[PDB]
């Protein structure tokens, strides 16, 4: 028996106010008029009476979209505050125009009429409001130590965050950008960048800021989509405040703008400069032409040096031929790196400091060219973006290992004279370190070729997904390294008392890299190595067996080894499978825009004159007219976009409501004509 | 394709072999890189078949010898290490060059990590996604293939079996 | 310049027919009347004129849902054939009632008005048609060799298939089952079973028949869902043409009907007969009570034998206690099987024929009980469903191995007298075969426990998914066995010339089960074994090396081995991963209905009196009233279901169309009143 | 015959709640305007 | 004989080919000597 009563009692109005509110809601030109006259004379009705469910007389008159009752209430001095916002949110032009011609609320007090109009994204209401000289407060910069931001955040943090989000939502509407900004493309780019960088700062309101940034990027892409000619697209892309706006969009990570089909057409025509209709030809003749131009890599580079402006000197200046020549030079470098480890060119293996062979003497200009190119990349173009590549770390590692190999070879040549057999050299002979670093640099140089996958149409998205899933490999190795450190600590602590010597063990071998694996858990480094190698099954089971008859210690060690194997394989590897499968499933939707953005960024790196020579040969010693043309193009694009959007806003629901309103008005007019 | 249960299975097999073909390019690039590095590091300590026991020089012996001495043998060793058939002591040289052995073992471990933990599970994710996409349109493809097999037996040409067609 | 003309010219009517058709379409009581009078007198208008887009005057009058023009056209002798079907498909009651009161077509000639009414699933139209004494032709049985089916299929197969599908779609409508059938539950069960079995026969029209079977099953479940009392549910489930209708639904594989919550309540109350509120108690006290009743398994079975109708004799007759006693007896059997291979009970290991030990003497009554229970299961209950279990094959294998072990032990006892050490026994000694078959039967008996997973709430759907994915394991092993046979044939053909002898090989071992693996590909059986064991990495690499210096043969063999390893692991295992992941993703939706059906089928196996004793102790020596009650229950359920369905058929579209029709009729009536 | 059957099936499968609703409002507005003109 | 089916196979019209009535006609042309091959039991079919 649960008793049910209204615990929050609302002060109900008198019966005289109910008649006035019912006359307002039903709609009557005479009953409301005489009710207001009686309220003026006898004071029977409070004019500012309000329903318990937040509905004043003016709000109900707005909800009925009738202008006569609204005009009479406006002339009868009804409380008009917080009533234009309801008409704006209802999105009716007549009521907003009438209220602009002159307690409880459903809107937060920081909302202005222009802000709500921008939130509702109605073109006519926003235009009619901005004609009345309205302004929006400027949101502050993200990192503020000023008093006006810090004190406001300290006093009322929720109101501050709500006000900032409301302002940024008002500024990000496509209609307000199309009306109030003279450069909607650059405004959309900038607002998308600020909203994306601000979503990470305000990590709790991340979804709304990400949605607003996506809205701005979509508006920029849709504004570019309305181009009806190649001249308009060339004017858009070449506008400088060669392809300036495309470089700006690449800077602001506008992947949807970059991967637009007409932008990709213009980039493809600029890429195949010397080949009219490269996509037209057969794949066999394309492969033959690519092979010929690649095999002509000593050519077209000497000709550039001896005659830059000849018939043949301008052949390498085209971007595709430049890319082919660079790829051919790198493949030739890797071929000589393969040839450097062969018996035909490498002899006299028992000298402490050897002079370089012919293959290494040929390798040296390539290494100097790579070093000089990476040095020039630090200066030319800039330094703040050189580290913002994530491929230049690999190049820096390659060049550092090359320099270390060269320096160690020089030291071993100048301080070691004579010959000595290789078995009696010391552990840290400079020659051995040089041969190790050269091999590591060979691995890095041959793995550098993955960056060329974005040019191909089939290996590009594959490399994009490879990066996507390496981002989760990086997360998985933290848990794996914690588990590895835990079990290594435990196993070394259990097993370090039974450490033997290399002399006692057979073949003078102490470690897990022997025929009979010895001292697998004796030291912490060897324990880490053993627990790493047990993942691939290369650690045998008898390494947990000690010389003495300590069967309890052996059993506890084998149990630790089995628990580590279970945790590190059965749980963790299949967890990694599930993680990468989920990440691949998410990225497979947006996998072609990313590849097209990466391919575009690779294409614009070959457009400029800098770095024309391959690394073998790169070490051998009025604005008003453009602004007005862009302004006409923007005017046409904005008009086309606003027309397409304004009738794409026509909806079955709104059309149906409009038809009922027109039918009701016409029936009432016909009834008044008959009566 | 004639059978009702093994037809779409072979269709999906072709669907995922189309992604096997894409995966082997990255795997072959990684294999060539690590083979080049390991052969360059390890070719100085090449022995002869006479000095090695049982006159065997290679990884197909009881005691695996000269795993990274030549480029062909380095490619074979790095291929066979995927299935765990390459032992760990092949990175150990006769001399006491512990730095060279450590760098070789580190290259071998990095290759094992890249070629198994990253690449095989990447291939798992790729083929799982491709199977999920093709599982919708998997019965129309089989019926088209079965029809194409059926019309190859309708004509009079090739009526005799290959024992009796000559 | 592609010329565009109408290649299929349609004979357009004269301008006099256009006026008549426009007057019919617009709606005019006077223009159509005078047009028909002029057509009667001057023969200016053909009354049966037809639009090019398949629209006669009567069809347009049907589309306008106006009965006056339809009545005048009916009185004016307009061609009425193939016009009731349009009114039925449009689903208007008045036009259908009026046309029932008296070239090109959009309907196939095999469609009758009752069949189209059943296809549209409108209750009022179906009722109004079935009141007019209409019949539906009976579809034939699935396997017909009769002339009337075979000749019709030979002359016109497409028409025959379309007619059969149309008839079965008409019979499967819920409204026709609710009206024309006196037992809608049994009719829905039978029709669902025939449609499910007919979908596999007509394998091309499989989707439609499967959809119709699912529709029938959904109708049966929804008819059961309208029960408002436990008495009605007990009347439904106990109706015999104890739980008879539940057994019928289990026979017809009605998983949705069985897994209904009220049926599961009734089954759960019948299952926990001696425990009022078993789900109420704590899990600890539940485990303690289950352990006590299980450990009392010698008890409650002797008491059943000495006093079946005592206080304690009826305790095991309850289903849950019977299940607990059976599980305890099986676990005790497995415990003695574990004890049989211990040194405490097994001694004198060098006798050719041993007498049985005490553990085997205790095992023998359990084996005899299992054999007698499986023999009784063949006779009691029936034989045609004993093979339709897929668990009785396992039981038959266990009992056959038990009988073989007993017979071999008897033979080895009666023909082998004396002692002999185990190393000089022959390869096929009967004792060794007995010990092998006993171990295989032990494996099978301990793996038999998987069938008890459906009782638990967490391991039931897991076993359902295990069966789901074993169904794809079975598909995968065909490709794997084909690949295995191919590579085994090739490797044996290459390697059989270098076969050695066991004497020449060390330790007199010839095979891959030695310390040094020898002759891995010498014979076809050993090649199959080697290629099987190479999947788990247990085959070493030196087995491809021959004694002679045939490096080309060794290289080709190693290349075959590597290709087999790649195909059988990298492609096939990850393909199997993808297949089972997809199958698990599909079955994870319908994974709880399957488990509840399996748990119900396990529960009804303990309800009956047969097999009350555990296998240790099972070898010790008026219908009119029920029909009328069921009829009242069916009347109430059908009325509730038809009311719920008939206003669930109310839709925004139909209500909106009805409101426009009423508004148009009222406005026309008001205009006629004014005029 | 096939083209006639296909065009009939497609042409009334093109009937949609939105288009039918718009057609009904247009017919209602036209009939109300005609009745008003008849009265006036 | 089936000319338009061969044309549709040439143009890779998989939806046209896998239509149920086309598959019926192909199945009746395939089981020429077995009226009702799908009718029989799987054991007698295997035999
Ligand atoms: C990423 C960016 C950085 C890349 C690396 C830049 C630096 C590169 C190369 C410089 C290496 C150090 C100087 C070697 C010569 C000097 C010397 O006497 O060394 C002493 C110490 O030697 C060592 O401890 C060996 C260090 C090897 C580092 C290899 C890194 C490989 C990274 C792979 C990454 C994949 C010799 O021994 P001792 O003390 O005489 O006894
Ligand atoms: C599934 C349903 C069927 C289940 C099995 C029913 C039959 C069970 C058992 C009967 C086995 C045959 C009779 C053995 C004794 C007779 C004899 O002389 O055998 C001779 C042949 O022996 C063989 O060839 C061994 C056959 C072993 C079969 C094991 C099947 C295990 C199935 C596991 C499935 C998981 C002895 O050798 P010789 O010829 O003297 O030389
Ligand atoms: C004693 C020690 C002995 C050691 C012996 C073994 C040596 C092993 C050497 C090899 C080590 C691993 C090398 C991995 C190379 C590939 C890296 C991933 C490539 C890839 O697909 O992702 C790219 C990132 O790569 C990158 O970010 C490149 C990372 C390069 C790291 C180099 C470290 C040195 C994406 O491309 P993107 O970066 O343009 O994506 C957009 C901007 N984020
Ligand atoms: C010289 C030879 C030496 C051999 C030595 C090795 C011997 C190995 C013995 C063990 C072999 C494998 C046994 C597998 C047991 C489990 C089977 C699957 C169980 C499962 O989850 O699925 C059930 C089916 O099981 C079933 O259908 C049971 C299949 C039993 C097959 C027994 C063959 C003998 C589903 O349950 P459900 O069938 O009720 O599902 C609804 C009606 N379909
Ligand atoms: C960190 C991330 C969270 C991990 C949470 C835990 C995960 C599960 C851990 C399971 C540990 C099992 C240890 C078994 C062990 O040491 O055996 C070796 C030792 C070797 O002596 O085994 C024994 O001593 C007992 C012999 C029977 C082993 C039965 C194992 C049952 C579980 C199998 C799991 C699947 C494989
Ligand atoms: C190409 C495609 C992109 C690949 C990008 C990179 C992927 C990750 C690479 C990780 C390399 C780890 C190398 C470890 C190594 O050489 O160990 C052998 C060597 C053998 O001496 O190990 C050591 O010297 C250190 C012993 C501890 C090893 C800890 C390993 C932590 C990472 C584990 C990952 C999961 C397994
Ligand atoms: C049946 C189902 C469809 C199968 C379709 C085909 C699938 C791919 C087959 C690939 C065969 C590769 C054979 C390699 C081989 O024999 O190596 C052993 C032999 C051993 O001598 O290797 C060589 O002789 C060459 C050494 C380099 C091997 C490079 C392998 C590249 C491909 C790797 C794939 C991933 C692992
Ligand atoms: C499988 C083994 C033998 C690979 C050995 C390494 C190289 C010989 C391969 C690996 C990556 C390959 C590259 C991958 C992608 C491309 C881009 C591709 O670009 C185009 O097709 C041009 C048109 C466009 O830009 O879209 C031209 C070949 C090239 C350089 C490939 C050239 C050959 C490379 C360097
Ligand atoms: C698992 C191991 C024992 C397989 C060994 C190889 C062969 C004995 C198998 C492998 C593939 C099998 C074939 C796979 C598919 C078919 C089609 C199948 O076609 C039908 O059922 C006829 C009706 C139709 O065409 O749909 C008849 C059996 C056949 C030839 C099978 C015959 C037996 C084959 C050749
Ligand atoms: C992990 C190892 C130690 C398992 C060794 C084998 C047995 C000791 C296990 C395996 C399967 C188990 C059974 C799995 C499921 C059930 C059903 C379960 O049923 C209930 O909870 C009763 C209520 C209901 O029917 O829903 C009772 C325990 C039981 C028989 C379990 C008893 C113990 C069993 C036989
Ligand atoms: Ca660089
Ligand atoms: Ca049984
Ligand atoms: Zn500030
Ligand atoms: Zn028949």
Author numbering:
A (entry chain C), C (entry chain A): 17 to 118, 135 to 273, 286 to 665, 705 to 758
B (entry chain D): 498 to 663
D (entry chain D): 719 to 758
E (entry chain D): 286 to 332
Q: What does the published report state?
A:
Like many other TRP channels, TRPC5 is permeable to Ca2+, with little selectivity among monovalent cations, and functions as a thermosensing channel. Here, we present structures of the human TRPC5-Gαi3 protein complexes using cryo-electron microscopy (cryo-EM) and demonstrate that Gαi3 can directly activate TRPC5, increasing its sensitivity to phosphatidylinositol 4,5-bisphosphate (PIP2) using electrophysiology. Electrophysiological analysis shows that Gαi3 increases the sensitivity of TRPC5 to phosphatidylinositol 4,5-bisphosphate (PIP2), thereby rendering TRPC5 more easily opened in the cell membrane, where the concentration of PIP2 is physiologically regulated.
To elucidate the structural features of TRPC5 prior to Gαi3 binding, we solved the cryo-EM structure of TRPC5 in the absence of Gαi3 in lipid nanodiscs, as all the previously reported structures of TRPC5 were in either detergent micelles or amphipols. As a result, the obtained cryo-EM data yielded two structures: TRPC5Class1 at 3.15 Å and TRPC5Class2 at 3.59 Å, with a major distribution for the former (65%) and a minor distribution for the latter (35%). Considering the similar particle distribution and structures of the two different conformations of TRPC5 in our structures of TRPC5 alone and TRPC5-Gαi3 complexes, we concluded that TRPC5 can exist in two different conformations regardless of Gαi3 binding.
